[PDB]
Design a protein around this nucleic acid. Structure first.
Ligand SMILES: [Mg+2]
Ligand SMILES: [Zn+2]
Ligand SMILES: [Zn+2]
Lengths: 900, 196
RNA sequence: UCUUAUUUUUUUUCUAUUUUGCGCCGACC
DNA sequence: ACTGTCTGGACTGGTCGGCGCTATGATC
DNA sequence: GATCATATTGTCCAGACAGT
């Protein structure tokens, strides 16, 4: 049968257990001889395992690559204090009597502490608090309650040095060094009944085991030895540390057997203690770390376990996996959000293991008969007994003829196969989704554009990874849970994440704007491009020059479901009167006539009645990320598959619109007439005059301190406020003098790409350059640059750039903008590390929380963190703008459904 | 304590006790600098101001590396002559003092300390990354690497006052050409008009 | 003209089936 | 019972590519 | 000449601790 590890019990290894688990005794501080063979009794002994392929292990008889490795033991001449337990040892040394060995507590106190230990349960914090309280109470008693022997304070010196404060016959206070043998002898006197009071297990954590008498040398496999390209074997750091330990132990044994004086024995004991302490942890405080002959410090077991590169993080929590690829991504609007572009070279390398059944026997037989060099083919074949055979040209037909039910065929990646698509860093669960394999003959990955905002991935050389599940359970889990269309709504804010961006928004605005009409050929072409099932063209809206014309709203209406009705305001609202009139007309009748709506239709108010876009222009508020109301309603009211189809169709339609109608930006997009430039210059002169007046008022002393502030930062804040008002006025002038016919203004207003400030910065001014939230001050004495007078606090001398990008900046203003950009870049480069550390901390704090079947969130111990998740038991992904149920939307939709 | 004061307390003033009194004078000019800022007589100087910042070039690092290598070579030669005198004796040592000194020298012991520091980029005294592989991607990269300046500050440390551009970098440090990520600000390039 | 020692049967073959580590530098997301 | 001081730990992830190092002073 | 034992022992935040 099969068994799993139900629980793990920790403890301290006893010397008897170390001796029993050891397959050999190590006494030679060497690894290999001149010819390269292992030395008997050495660290590289075959009894501890084999790394070289030729050798065969003595203990288990297995060759390299399959021998698990066997531990050894070293009999230390003298006991050595374990550093990791050392401080804990001191605690026990402050809790037990030096003669009787019992704890320094009364019987009643011991019993009361036993009841306290039994009552509280299994919470770790209470146990540590009780242990600390018991240690503090026992450490202040100088008389043993059981024997009456006097006690002395014990001073702990890092890392493994113990001093006992003793008194001579003359009353002088001196320090006696407690040798590890004396410490172990004192620890041996503590009975098993007092161990729970000290936080030690009677049968698993005996204090005498905290002092090392037998050192467990690791197996050969866990510290492997390799041969370099120069023919010289490269030993591990642990091997060198163990060589030093064995040499020092042998020297100590020889000196002890020779009757060496006490000066020799304690010196060698200290050397062995230092070696063992470095072997346990080379980064111990208060000691010099062990270094190689080249001056490189070694990393021992503690550094192997801890750290980012340690076993826990670099090998256990996260590790490299098989059947994975990684390459650059390129855009592909022609594929669905469910599909990923897999290169042919990647597809012919990564293989899906498919078992031969009664329905896929012919397909897998054809895959085997194609071979690894022909697509679609196979690379490996596994028989039911379990031998894997690689398919070459010779046995390609023979294996195909031998194929039967129960065999496994590692076939090439085919269309429709489910694979994982992950981009690093993975800040959220939406950073990986299961896509469908689409095989194309190029070299790069291809990912659909609406799936990019979930990945936070652009196409400026982004690298993305792909993982192919092997087991059927993993493939099913990827297909059902982590499918792309199932994660359109972001659980972080309950809004659309998989959404149209940039050119999708621009094409939607171009199609759905007022006065946008298309010919019959254009309408048929966009219908075919978007893959819509429109068999017959709708009635044309108007006839121009004898030919029919279709409104873009009519074409957009075919995407929406026939029973959809929603009205809202978008970001293109600048005349609230028309929007208010439309809202009032909708409010009275609740089913306004389409002719009545079209009479007073406004691009700033989106209104869809029965799937017909009667008014409004498409922008980021329609199906953009974090703002699309239409996409949010479509996902929640019509499922995810219909939402995915709508997203694909609308993205293709908008791409067709933006491709053939013509979308471009030029140098005249930021061009302004002479009146706008004159107004901007007037604003500049007014701002500099106000700044100079403020400076003069501060100099003459009539400037008023702000409440709680002195002259300097008050004047600085006033100057910054004046410059901000000037920047706002310049931006308002630029917006006034730039119409909606501008493509850059279209992109800024519709929310496709960029902002209004971006156009303002390229046309009107750059504003004031600020560092760390204040004006630029770092530089020379009294000035930032030497081109200004010292002590000048003017706008031009402190980072206020008057000209824009189109007019070109002065060298001083260019330098100030460089300081601002450098500050921004440093801000992001500093923020990323802190954000990642905080994310890791939060994840490790909340990794184990899970909603149970009764709706309660509990920790693995059993403590109910929440009796109901979110206090209402509602998924934030399925929540409506952070609310439980959108009563307004439900009522309106139901009323419209019953009225229609 | 005498050795510590002689070899650690302002070694740039000397190591002999005779100049010790003068070191006290150098202490006094420190105390004033501490006192005035504690009393408002003088302002705090900028650590990132280039008047207080020097640029160790390849010559100074080569001088330090050659000093370390020559000291180790000197100690090796001293051990070699000591061993030769202890083995052969006074007769063979002083019969030809020209050959005795020459044979007690191992030049490679010096050489393998210099070029190795120019190979791995590790410098004596804990300094590392001094020597790097020259970038040969194109004509621009090699010139940028040859006109590159690094900082001893750690890359993971947020140095808001050090990574940001300074007003004294005009004409000395390029205001725009900086690397991204943790290397931003701490790694700069010399300006076209910069003279050292 | 003299003490204080003992004694026995139930185990088989000419031999064998895919280099880590350390540290540096640079770049990308 | 407060207060400044000493000691200890962590410092986002991933990827591409390169460079370079991992003996020696006696002994017959 | 060819071998061989030995090869040294930067900041910031939080918890514990003498001092008043
Ligand atoms: Mg990118
Ligand atoms: Zn084995
Ligand atoms: Zn006792």
């Amino acid at each position: 049968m099969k068994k799993v590890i139900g629980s793990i019990e920790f403890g301290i290894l006893s010397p008897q257990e170390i001796r029993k688990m050891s397959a050999a005794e190590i006494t030679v501080p060497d690894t290999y001889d001149d010819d390269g063979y292992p030395i008997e009794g050495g660290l590289m002994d075959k009894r501890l395992g084999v790394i070289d392929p030729g050798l065969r292990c003595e203990t288990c008889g297995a060759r390299a690559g399959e021998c698990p490795g066997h531990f050894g033991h070293i009999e230390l001449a003298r006991p050595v204090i374990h550093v990791g337990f050392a401080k804990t040892i001191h605690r026990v040394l402050e809790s037990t009597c030096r003669e009787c060995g019992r704890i320094k507590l009364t019987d009643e106190e011991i019993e009361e502490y036993m009841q306290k230990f039994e009552v509280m349960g299994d919470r770790k914090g209470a146990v540590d608090k009780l242990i600390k309280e018991i240690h503090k109470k026992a450490k202040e008693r100088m008389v043993c309650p059981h024997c009456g022997a006097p006690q002395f304070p014990i001073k702990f010196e890092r890392p493994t040095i113990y001093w006992e404060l003793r008194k001579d016959e003359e009353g002088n206070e001196y320090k006696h060094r407690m040798m590890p043998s004396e410490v172990r002898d004192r620890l041996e006197k503590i009975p098993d009944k007092d161990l729970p009071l000290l936080g030690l297990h009677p049968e698993k954590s005996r204090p005498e085991w905290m002092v090392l008498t037998v050192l467990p040398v690791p197996p050969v496999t866990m510290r492997p030895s390799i041969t370099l390209e120069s023919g010289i074997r490269a030993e591990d750091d642990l091997t060198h540390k163990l060589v030093d330990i064995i040499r020092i132990n042998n020297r100590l044994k020889s000196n002890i057997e020779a009757g060496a004086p006490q000066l020799i024995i304690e010196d060698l004991w200290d050397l062995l203690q230092y070696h063992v302490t470095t072997y346990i942890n080379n980064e111990t405080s208060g000691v010099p770390p062990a270094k190689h002959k080249s001056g490189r410090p070694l990393k021992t077991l503690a550094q192997r376990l801890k750290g980012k590169e340690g076993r826990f993080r670099g090998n256990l929590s996260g590790k490299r996996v098989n059947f994975s690829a990684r390459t650059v991504i390129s855009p592909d609007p022609m594929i669905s959000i469910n599909e990923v572009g897999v290169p042919l070279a990647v597809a012919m390398e990564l293989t899906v293991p498919e078992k031969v059944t009664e329905f896929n026997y012919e397909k897998l037989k054809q895959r085997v008969l194609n071979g690894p060099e022909k697509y679609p083919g196979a690379n490996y074949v596994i028989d039911p007994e379990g031998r894997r055979i690689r398919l070459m040209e010779s046995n390609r037909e023979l294996i195909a003829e031998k194929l039967d039910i129960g065999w496994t065929v590692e076939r090439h990646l085919e269309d429709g196969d489910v694979v994982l698509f992950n981009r690093q860093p993975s800040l959220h669960r939406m950073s990986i989704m299961a896509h469908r394999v689409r095989v194309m003959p190029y070299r790069t990955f291809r990912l659909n554009l609406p799936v990019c905002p979930p990945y936070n991935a652009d196409f400026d050389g982004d690298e993305m990874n792909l993982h192919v599940p092997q087991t059927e359970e993993a493939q099913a889990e990827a297909k059902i849970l982590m499918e792309v269309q199932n994660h359109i709504i972001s659980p972080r804010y309950g809004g659309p994440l998989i959404a149209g961006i940039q050119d999708h928004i621009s094409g939607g605005y171009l199609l759905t704007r007022e006065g946008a009409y298309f010919t019959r050929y254009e309408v048929e072409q966009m219908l075919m491009f978007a893959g819509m099932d429109v068999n017959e063209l709708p009635e044309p809206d108007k006839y121009e020059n004898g030919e029919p014309l279709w409104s873009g709203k009519t074409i957009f209406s075919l995407l929406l479901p026939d029973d959809l009705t929603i009205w809202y305001r978008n970001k293109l609202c600048d005349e609230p009167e028309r929007c208010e009139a439309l809202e009032k007309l909708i409010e009275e009748k609740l089913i306004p006539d389409p002719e009545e709506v079209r009479k007073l239709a406004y691009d700033g108010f989106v209104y869809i009645q029965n799937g017909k876009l009667l008014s409004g222009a498409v922008d980021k508020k329609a199906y953009g990320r974090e703002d699309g109301k239409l996409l949010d309603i479509i996902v929640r009211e019509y499922g995810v598959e219909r939402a995915r189809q709508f997203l694909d169709q609308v993205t293709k339609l908008t791409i067709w619109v933006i491709t053939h109608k013509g979308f471009t930006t030029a140098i005249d997009d930021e061009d302004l007439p002479q009146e706008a430039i004159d107004r901007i210059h007037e604003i500049i002169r007014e701002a500099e005059e106000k700044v100079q007046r403020l400076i003069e008022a501060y100099k003459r002393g009539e400037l008023e301190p702000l409440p709680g502030k002195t002259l300097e930062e008050t004047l600085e804040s006033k100057i910054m406020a004046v410059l901000a008002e000037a920047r706002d006025n310049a931006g308002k002038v630029a917006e006034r003098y730039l119409g909606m016919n501008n493509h850059a203004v279209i992109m800024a207003k519709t929310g496709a790409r960029g902002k209004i400030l971006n156009i303002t910065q390229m046309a009107a001014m750059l504003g004031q350059q600020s560092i760390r939230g204040k004006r630029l001050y770092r530089g020379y004495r009294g000035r930032v640059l030497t081109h200004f007078k010292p002590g000048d606090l003017g706008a031009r001398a402190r980072g206020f750039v008057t000209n824009s990008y189109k007019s070109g900046l002065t060298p001083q203003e260019y330098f100030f903008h460089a300081m601002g950009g450098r500050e921004g870049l440093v801000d992001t480069a500093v923020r990323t590390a802190q954000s990642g550390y905080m994310q890791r901390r939060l994840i490790n704090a909340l990794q184990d929380l899970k909603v149970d079947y009764d709706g309660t969130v509990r920790d693995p111990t059993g403590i109910i963190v929440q009796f109901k998740y979110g206090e209402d038991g509602v998924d934030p992904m399925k929540s409506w703008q952070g609310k439980t149920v959108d009563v307004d939307r439900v009522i309106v939709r139901t009323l419209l459904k019953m009225r229609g | 304590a005498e050795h510590i004061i002689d070899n650690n307390l302002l070694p740039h003033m000397g190591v002999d006790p005779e100049n010790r009194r003068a070191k006290a004078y150098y202490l006094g000019m420190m105390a004033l600098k501490v006192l005035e800022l504690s009393l408002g007589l003088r302002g705090e100087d900028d650590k990132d101001h280039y008047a207080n910042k020097r640029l160790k070039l390849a010559g100074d690092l080569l001088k330090d590396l050659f000093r370390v290598a020559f000291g180790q070579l000197v100690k090796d030669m001293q051990y070699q002559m000591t061993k030769t005198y202890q083995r052969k004796g006074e007769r063979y040592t002083f019969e030809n003092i020209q050959r005795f000194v020459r044979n007690s020298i191992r030049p490679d012991v010096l050489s393998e300390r210099i070029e190795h520091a120019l190979a791995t980029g590790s410098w004596p005294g804990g300094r590392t990354g001094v020597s790097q592989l020259l970038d040969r991607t194109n004509y621009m990269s090699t010139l940028s690497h040859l006109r590159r300046v690094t900082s001893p500050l750690s890359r993971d440390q947020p140095h808001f006052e050090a990574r940001d551009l300074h007003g004294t970098h005009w004409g000395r440090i390029c205001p725009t050409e900086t690397p991204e990520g943790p290397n931003c600000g701490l790694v700069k390039n010399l300006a076209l008009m910069s003279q050292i």
